[model samples]
Target: MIRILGEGKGSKLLENLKEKLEEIVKKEIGDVHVNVILVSEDEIKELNQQFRGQDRPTDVLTFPLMEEDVYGEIYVCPLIVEENAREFNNTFEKELLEVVIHGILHLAGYDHEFEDKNSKEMFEKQKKYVEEVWGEWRSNPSEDSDPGKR
Candidate 1:
C-alpha cells in the first residue's frame, strides 16, 4: 500500500504524483509497496543539515523506511519548489515532479557526482524517466538544456 502524509500548503494532486511515482518504481525496480510522506521545510532543512551537512533550505529530502519493499519518507517544501520554478522558468508541477523522481533515484542508490560516470548514468535515467512521464509539462526555458540544473 502506498500512503501519503502531507503537511503545510500543497496541491491535492500530490496523490496523483504519488501514483505516478509508484508506477515508475514498480516498472523500474519490480513490485514494491511504497509510502511517501511530505514534511515541512524546517523538517527538511534539519534533515539536509544532518544527512548532507548543508545549512540551506532544499526542495526535497528522503529517508528510506522499510527495506522489505522500499518504503520511505520524502520531505518536500512547496515553498522552495515554487521559488525554484520561478527562477528556472518552470511550472510548480514540473519542478515538483522532478523533486519526487530525484528522491526516488536516491532510494534506488543513484547519485550525481562531478566525475562519476555511474552516477551520471543514473542521473540521466532519472531525468529521462521524469521527462517521459511528465514530458508534456516541460517548457524549454533555454535551448542549451542546462546540464547544471538537472
Candidate 2:
C-alpha cells in the first residue's frame, strides 16, 4: 500500500498516482509498502541533518524500513517542490509526483548522487514514468489546489 498525506488537489492527484507508482517500483524490486509525507522546510532540515548528515532541507528523503512488504517512508517538502517547479519550468503537480517517485526509486535501490552506471538512468526512469503516469491530466497549479503554495 502507498500512503500519502495532505488534503489538497495536490494530494488527491498524488493519491491517484499510487497504483502506478507501485507498479513502477514493483517492476524494479517487487511489491512494497510506502508512505509519503508532506513536511515543512524546518522539519525537513532537521530530518536531513539527523539522518542524512546534510544540515539543510531537500525535496525528498527516503527511509527504508525493509521487510516482507518493504516499508519505506518518503518525506517531501512541498515548499521545495514549488521552488523546483519554478526552477525547472514545470508544474507543481509534476514536481510533486517526481519527488515522490524519486523517493520510491531510492527505496528500490536507485541513486543519482554518485556517478555510477545506475546514476545516469536513475532519472531516465523517472522521466519516462512521469510522462507515462501523466497525460492530459497535467494542469496548471492554483493556490487553492496546490497545498504548498507560497
Candidate 3:
C-alpha cells in the first residue's frame, strides 16, 4: 500500500504518480509498502532537525524501516520542490516526481553523500530512474512536455 498525505498544490496528480512509483519500487524491493507524505517547509524543517539534526528544510527525507511487510516512509516538501523546479528549469510535477524517486532510492539503500564508487552507482541509478520516468521532457524542458501542464 502506498499512502499520501498533506494538501499541497498539484496534489491531484500525486495519486497517479504514486501508482507508477509503487510499480517501480515493487520491482526493485519485492512488494514492500511505502508512505509518501507531502509537507510544508516548516514541518519538514522540524522533521529534519529532529531526525537528521539539520536545522533546514529539504526537498525529501526518507526513513527506512525495512520491516517484513513495509519498507519505509518518505517525506517530501512541495514548497522546496517547487523552488527546485524553477531553479532546475523543470516543471513542478517533474521536480516533485524526481524527489519522490530520490527518496525511494534512499529507502532502497542508495546514497550519494560521499564521493565514492557507491555514490557514483547510486547517482547513476537515480538518473536512470528519473530518465525513465520523465523521458524526453528531461532532454528539453522547452518542448512543452512539462508534466505539470499535463
Candidate 4:
C-alpha cells in the first residue's frame, strides 16, 4: 500500500502517483507500504532539521522504517523540488518524479550519500526509471528522441 497526503500543486500532480510508485517498489522489494507527505518550504526545513540536522530544506527525506510491512515514510518538499528542477534545467514534474523514485529506491535497499562514495549506482537506477516513465509520457521539445541526461 502507498498513500500520499497534501494539498499543494505538486501534490495534485502526484494524485495518481501512489499506485505507480507502489508498483515500482513491488517490482523490486515485494509488498511494502510507503507513506508520502508533501509539505511547504518552511515546514520541510523543520523536518529536515529534526530528522537530518540539516537546517535547509532538501527535496526528499525518507525515514526507512522497514518494519511491520512498512517500507518507510517519505516527506517531500515540492518547493525545494521546483528549485532543484530549475537548477538542473529539468521540468518540475520530471524532478519531482525523480525525487519520489529516489525515495523508493532508498526504501528498497539502495544507497548513496555518505554510505556511498557518490558511487552513483542508486542514482543511475533512479535516472533509468525516471526516463522510462516520464520520457514516454511527458513531452520534451528539446530532447527530441533522446531520453535526456539524468
lDDT of 4 at 63: 68
Clashing pairs in 2: none
**Which residue pairs clash in candidate 1?**
none
lDDT of 1: 0.60
Off by over 4 Å in 1: 9-11, 42-56, 64-70, 106-118, 136-150
Q: What would the per-residue lDDT of candidate 2 be over residues 1-150, giving only the tens digit for each residue?
A: 577763333466676666777777777775666677667677788878877878887766666554443365667777777786666756666677777666566555544342463565667766776765554345433423444656
Query: lDDT per prediction?
Result: 0.60, 0.64, 0.64, 0.64
Q: Flag regions of model 4 displaced more than 4 Å.
A: 49-55, 64-70, 107-114, 139-150
Per-residue lDDT tens digits for candidate 1, residues 16-110, read 45566666776667455434556566766776787778877877665644354345566677678777766776666666666566545544554
Candidate 3 per-residue lDDT, tens place, 2-116, comes to 6666656535556655566665677677565556777778988888888788899877766655444434567787788778666677576667766666655554554334246
The parts of candidate 2 lying over 4 Å away from their true place are 5-10, 25-30, 49-55, 64-70, 104-118, 139-150
- Error (Å) of candidate 2 at residue 142 is 8.3
Better model by lDDT, 1 or 4?
A: 4
Off by over 4 Å in 3: 49-55, 64-70, 106-118, 136-150
lDDT of 4 by residue, 1-150 (tens): 556665455565665455566667778776665667788788888878777787987666666554433455677777877676666765777777876676566554543342542347666777766765565446643322347645
- Shift in Å, residue 1, candidate 1: 5.0
Lowest summed-lDDT stretch of 10 residues in model 1?
Answer: 109-118
Ranking by TM-score: 4, 3, 2, 1
